Design a protein around this ligand. Structure first.
Ligand SMILES: CCCCCCCCCCCCO[C@@H]1O[C@H](CO)[C@@H](O[C@H]2O[C@H](CO)[C@@H](O)[C@H](O)[C@H]2O)[C@H](O)[C@H]1O
Lengths: 50, 51
């Protein structure tokens, strides 16, 4: 259960792109969207709901 | 030589003609290009970690 929890709770959000091609006429602002990386601290780990 | 070849100018010619013949037939199969390979070899590593 713990293994599975950590696997669902300590992942990278893959993240797309705002104004990705193909885009609609206009667009104007093209910027990458960065999501969350992964847990780093020992705490972040002690967290994670089981 | 020289003295040898001065009284043997056919022989003289023939050493010249062989050299020319050899070097001639070579011009027929040499690679041609602007410059020789004068650039440092580089090897490239690529991966994409998506997003
Ligand atoms: C980096 C690689 C290079 C490889 C290529 C090597 C080739 C070099 C060629 C040199 C050979 C020359 O050989 C040369 O023959 C002629 C023949 O007339 C001689 O010529 C003359 O020598 C003396 C000096 O006045 C006289 O006594 C003589 O009467 C006269 O004939 C030379 O004594 C000899 O030195």
């Amino acid at each position: 259960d713990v293994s599975s929890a950590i696997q669902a709770q300590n992942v990278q959000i893959s993240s797309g792109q705002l104004g990705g091609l193909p885009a609609v006429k206009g667009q104007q602002l093209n910027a990458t969207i960065i999501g969350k990386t992964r847990l780093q601290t020992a705490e972040q780990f002690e967290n994670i709901l089981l | 030589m020289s003295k040898f070849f001065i009284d043997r100018p056919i022989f003289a010619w023939v050493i010249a003609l062989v050299i020319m013949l050899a070097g001639g037939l070579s011009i027929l199969s040499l690679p041609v290009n602007q410059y020789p390979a004068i650039a440092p070899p580089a090897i490239a590593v690529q991966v994409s970690y998506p997003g």
